[PDB]
Design a binder for this molecule. Structure first.
Ligand SMILES: CC(=O)N[C@H]1[C@H](O[C@H]2[C@@H](O)[C@H](O)[C@@H](CO)O[C@@H]2O)O[C@H](CO)[C@@H](O)[C@@H]1O
Ligand SMILES: [Mn+2]
Ligand SMILES: [Mn+2]
Ligand SMILES: [Mn+2]
Ligand SMILES: [Mn+2]
Ligand SMILES: [Mn+2]
Ligand SMILES: [Mn+2]
Ligand SMILES: [Mn+2]
Ligand SMILES: [Mn+2]
Ligand SMILES: [Mn+2]
Length: 434
């Protein structure tokens, strides 16, 4: 029961790339069928593809009008990638989506990313007239990352997160603030190093109090998310980067989506350290990643064959960078991304990824009872015209379905399937009294 109690989550990048309500419902249907508990839907990730009915934002001593914010965001998103399939989900569509998923026992966890991966929000702030929102590193300007020194850009971004969190209140449980990959473009994937650099290498032009400002920013977003009764979540790479606790402390109520163990010259906190500091961990191991369009071996990083290998070889309990410690988890999340958002979305390939993750960790995933429910609905209601012996067999086969444990795992699907087959056989064997 400890395994079944974990969250099993599929993540979809509907920030970079448009997904229709119809497509998202299909993903939810497959998630339910395969025994998942949640859909993790990025809506702000480079692109911003979710618009509230009221997008008025109060910051900087004024209100930015809802119509202008909407227009700024649509335009800013299109400047990132003008997706021929669509620009954004509406509030009505999101409310209906969350309700659709709720009726299937599927939760929804949104991401609206900052202070990185916010190309569209930066664009929108400029369309509104906010000056110089982008972070720059020695003359290289980031297209994705806000400058934490810019009070007006920061205040707007926070108010925008607040506006979305207010919407998601009471209809969801977790809100992912992201926080990954600060200034990845401008610093060539060294942004955390850069933010910490001035403390250790002063008078060299590194951002003064860079990392300390990032901690404060992260903590203020956590405060804002918690005020709405939501649990804040964030990706791990910037949290105690280089295992450095000397800049300040992150809010313990931030759940960590642990997606990377780091790489050469990019030294992240271990999951051991983060657990010790008091953070819950959602295992989001990039072993399982799939980037749309990279569909076979040789087609680049996080290609589908690599992700299926990752799922085969790295179980849901294997967290990045454990330092050999036993790391508890709240669950696991398999993620599909749209780094090249003009790539064709292939449902069957995403479903294969999701199915493989479910099958490789089958004791964790819920079983599927829907066919069992259907079979019970197909039993003839009135059995009086059949022989007592044939009737008893049917009643016994029905009782046996109703007596199945109601929280079986996917590993035990055969038990359900056998019970269905027995019922069908007994119904087929109903014999009319002569
Ligand atoms: C949390 C997360 O998964 N973030 C991104 C991550 O990014 C890639 C890649 O885009 C970066 O260039 C490198 C160096 O920082 O890191 C990762 O390899 O993985 C996903 C798949 O590429 C992205 O879609 C995520 O946005
Ligand atoms: Mn107007
Ligand atoms: Mn641009
Ligand atoms: Mn159901
Ligand atoms: Mn500065
Ligand atoms: Mn180090
Ligand atoms: Mn292959
Ligand atoms: Mn049902
Ligand atoms: Mn049904
Ligand atoms: Mn039980």
């Amino acid at each position: 029961n400890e395994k079944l109690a974990k969250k099993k989550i599929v993540s979809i990048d509907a920030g970079r790339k448009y997904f229709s309500p119809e497509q998202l419902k299909e993903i939810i249907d497959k998630a339910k069928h395969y025994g998942y508990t949640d859909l993790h839907l990025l809506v702000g990730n480079d692109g911003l593809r979710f618009m509230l009915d009221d997008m008025s934002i109060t910051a900087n001593g004024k209100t930015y009008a809802s119509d202008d914010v909407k227009r700024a965001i649509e335009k800013g998103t299109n400047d990132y990638y003008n997706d021929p399939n669509g620009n954004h989900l509406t509030e009505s569509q999101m409310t209906d989506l969350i309700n659709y998923a709720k009726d299937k026992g599927i939760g929804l966890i949104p991401t609206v990313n900052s202070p990185g991966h916010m190309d569209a929000i930066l664009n929108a702030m400029k369309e509104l007239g906010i000056q110089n929102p982008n972070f720059s590193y020695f003359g290289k300007k980031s297209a994705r990352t806000v400058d934490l020194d810019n009070e007006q850009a920061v205040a707007f971004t926070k108010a925008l997160i607040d506006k979305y969190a207010a919407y998601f209140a009471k209809k969801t449980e977790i809100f992912n603030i992201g926080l990954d990959q600060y200034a990845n473009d401008a610093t060539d994937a060294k942004g955390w190093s850069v933010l910490q650099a001035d403390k250790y290498y002063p008078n060299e032009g590194y951002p003064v109090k860079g990392y300390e400002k990032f901690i404060a920013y992260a903590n203020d977003l956590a405060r804002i998310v918690k005020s709405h009764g939501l649990k804040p979540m964030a990706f791990n790479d910037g949290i105690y980067y280089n295992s450095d606790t000397s800049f300040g402390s992150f809010d313990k109520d931030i759940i960590v989506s642990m997606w990377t163990g780091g790489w050469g010259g990019y030294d992240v906190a271990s999951s051991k350290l983060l657990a010790e500091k008091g953070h819950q961990i959602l295992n989001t191991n990039d072993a399982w990643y799939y980037v749309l369009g990279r569909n076979a071996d040789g087609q680049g990083w996080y290609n589908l064959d690599q992700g299926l290998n990752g799922i085969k070889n790295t179980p849901i309990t294997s967290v990045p960078k454990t330092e050999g410690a036993d790391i508890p988890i709240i669950g696991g999340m398999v993620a599909a991304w749209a780094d090249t958002p003009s790539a064709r979305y292939s449902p069957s390939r995403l479903f294969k990824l999701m199915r493989h993750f479910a099958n490789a960790n089958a004791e964790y995933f819920a079983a599927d009872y829907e066919s069992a429910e259907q079979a019970l609905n197909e039993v003839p209601k009135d059995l009086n015209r059949y022989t007592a012996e044939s009737v008893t067999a049917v009643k016994e086969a029905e009782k046996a379905i109703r007596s199945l444990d109601s929280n079986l795992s996917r590993a035990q699907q055969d038990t359900i399937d056998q019970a269905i087959a027995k019922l069908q056989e007994t119904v087929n064997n109903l014999t009319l009294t002569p």
